[PDB]
Ligand binder design. Structure first.
Ligand SMILES: *[C@@H]1C(=O)N(CC)C(=O)[C@H]1c1cccc(C(N)=O)c1
Lengths: 453, 167
């Protein structure tokens, strides 16, 4: 075994014990490396830059989740400290080849991975980047040169900042006639495709920095989780817009046509694996103003009722069927984000930040790994896009929807509910009749494409 | 077959409401929680000698999906309306949650409990008398709990089960 310096001259030389590092029973499934359960920051930074082997998964996890237990400025200090190794002949020649070069190389891998995949720490603190460039400048060596250059090229780059898709579908509204666009005038296939494209881009824009530390639930959520929130607000807007379309169609025949068309949009969302789209529709249908419209759902064809029940069933038993179905499909898809949010929050709130062993505090790294597993799953669905053509006018129409207008939430949701009670009064009030509002035909063009690909 | 009660946790985000259910399910001497599994939200319990199963829905973290509340709430037979005793706004939000529960269930008598949760050692801004008065205006029980010590957690949930049984 190698003779390392004293802990008084080099902190990372201190040996492993029950007081500074602990492990899980299992090993990395594909790498055979032990799984760290907890440790001190010193021991975690030692194992992040371990001399015996490279640990890419641990680097991945650490760099995603360390901010809950160590500041960016403190991590940079601890990795520069790790690189500055003092000596404790044949013993020295082995030390320099089996301890110093591997460790120094692993520190540089951390630096590289940090500037590449978590550059926001540097964007948010210019002094952190000043120090990183300073450190990288002092690095000298033949083995180092190649990695020092790569890092410098990433920093400067970061500082600078398929086949034919299907034909676009049109129904009553024609290309460019943006003034006539509505739920029944636009083609139901194209509504679903264009909403799937918006919702996919909204999904792909959410980063782990908006999720780690449950920051979207905290007072600075608007600063720290802007892409997640835009995504949730689009979803909410579309649910509300669907409800608005329904209850503002006072004529029963026209309302049946409206509900039926939304169920067709749902069917296309199912085809495209847009589960966010699916649940937007299901949420609208199970809302207080829509759910009670028994005279409307009575006239809905059985095939559309069945489509709606299967979609509703995905959410039952704590998303049991949704969870199975998402696992069974391959990208492109648009997952429902809410489950991930709940799982990250509960993982973080339901587990301790620190574990105590022989009265010594150890950072609970396994809690952080569990969170990084959820962020990795989010990311696995963000890599693959859809092979659908954007229609810029239909896109702009859904981006600019604003069913609420200037009304507050309570005001608007009470207006929707009072509209529901007006169009279909509560028993034993008889059902009134209402005039038609649509001067165009109510018949759908269906969900099968009009022409061949 | 033993009776199963579908319970729903409703309340403001950002105030650690998830502690109530986490502390119920996780054994009184274990802290290693995994929300990904079925045992994380189901628990067989004995209440007044009658064995039952509590299935608890807590959507903590999905507050911004405001249009999904009705859908989530309609799954419940009983509701735990939770606020944090250090956050007055979360206490003031209760009136609308209850109104929404009543609308969703289409009933003025829905089994429900008011839960005042002490999530940390930050200063109390909601006095027990205020919440005791609010709970009496609605005709429901008030239970106060601690996220640190587990004090009041069983009582909050068991009081709800009793409200469903006596409905
Ligand atoms: C407890 C509380 O009352 N407030 C308002 C001051 C909180 O922010 C809340 C809190 C929030 C998240 C988590 C936790 C926790 N550790 O239980 C507490």
């Amino acid at each position: 075994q190698m003779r390392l310096p004293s802990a008084d001259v080099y902190r990372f030389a201190e040996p492993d014990s029950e007081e500074n590092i602990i492990f899980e029973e299992n090993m990395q499934p594909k790498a055979g490396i032990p799984i760290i359960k907890a440790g001190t920051v010193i021991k975690l930074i030692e194992r992040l830059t371990y001399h015996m082997y490279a640990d890419p998964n641990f680097v991945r996890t650490f760099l995603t989740t360390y901010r809950s237990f160590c500041k960016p400025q403190e991590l940079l200090s601890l990795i520069i400290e790790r690189f500055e190794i003092p000596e404790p002949s044949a013993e020295l020649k082995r030390f320099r080849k089996e301890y110093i070069q591997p460790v120094q190389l692993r520190v540089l891998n951390v630096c590289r991975h940090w500037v590449e995949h978590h550059f926001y720490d540097f964007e948010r603190d210019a002094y952190l980047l000043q120090r990183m460039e300073e450190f990288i400048g002092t690095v000298r060596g033949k083995a180092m040169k190649k990695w020092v250059e790569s890092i410098t090229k990433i920093i400067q780059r970061k500082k600078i900042a398929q086949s034919s898709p299907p034909t676009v579908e049109w129904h009553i509204s024609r290309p460019g006639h943006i003034e006539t666009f509505d739920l029944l005038t636009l083609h139901p296939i194209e509504i679903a495709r264009q909403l799937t494209l918006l919702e996919s881009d909204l999904y792909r824009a959410v980063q782990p920095s908006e999720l780690v530390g449950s920051v979207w639930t905290k007072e600075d959520k608007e600063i720290n989780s802007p892409n997640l929130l835009k995504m949730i607000r689009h979803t909410t807007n579309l649910t509300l817009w669907f409800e608005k379309c329904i209850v503002e169609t006072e004529n029963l025949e026209e309302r049946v046509a409206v509900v039926s068309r939304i169920i067709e949009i749902l069917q296309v969302f199912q085809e495209l694996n847009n589960f966010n789209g699916v649940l937007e529709v299901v949420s609208a249908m199970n809302s207080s103003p829509v759910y009670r419209l028994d005279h409307t759902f009575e006239q809905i064809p059985s095939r559309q009722k069945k489509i709606l029940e299967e979609a509703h069933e995905l959410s039952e038993d704590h998303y049991k069927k949704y969870l199975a179905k998402l696992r069974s499909i391959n990208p492109p898809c648009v997952p429902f984000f809410g489950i991930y949010l709940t799982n990250i929050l509960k993982t973080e709130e339901g587990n301790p930040e620190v574990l105590k062993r022989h009265g010594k505090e150890l950072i609970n790294f396994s809690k952080r790994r569990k969170v990084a597993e959820i962020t990795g799953e989010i990311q696995q669905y963000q890599n693959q896009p859809y092979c659908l053509r954007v229609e810029s006018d239909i896109k702009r129409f859904f981006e600019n929807l604003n069913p609420m207008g200037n009304s507050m939430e309570k005001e608007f949701t009470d207006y929707l509910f009072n509209k529901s009670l007006e169009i279909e009064p509560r028993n034993p009030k008889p059902l009134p009749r209402f005039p038609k509002k649509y001067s165009y035909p109510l018949k759908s063009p269906g969900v099968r494409p009009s022409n061949p690909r | 077959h033993m009776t199963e009660y579908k319970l729903v946790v409703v309340g403001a985000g950002g105030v650690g409401k998830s502690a109530l259910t986490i502390q119920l399910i996780q054994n009184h001497f274990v802290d290693e929680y995994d929300p990904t599994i079925e045992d994380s939200y189901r628990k067989q319990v004995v209440i007044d000698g009658e064995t039952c199963l509590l299935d608890i829905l807590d959507t903590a973290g999905q507050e911004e999906y405001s249009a999904m509340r009705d859908q989530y709430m309609r799954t419940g037979e009983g509701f735990l309306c939770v606020f944090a005793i250090n956050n007055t706004k979360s206490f003031e939000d209760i009136h609308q949650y209850r109104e929404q529960i009543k609308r969703v269930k289409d009933s003025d008598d829905v089994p429900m409990v008011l839960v005042g949760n002490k999530c940390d050692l930050a200063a109390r801004t909601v006095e027990s008398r205020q919440a005791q008065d609010l709970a009496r205006s609605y005709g429901i029980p008030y239970i106060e709990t601690s996220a640190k010590t587990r004090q009041g957690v069983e009582d909050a949930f068991y009081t709800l089960v009793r409200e469903i049984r006596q409905h």
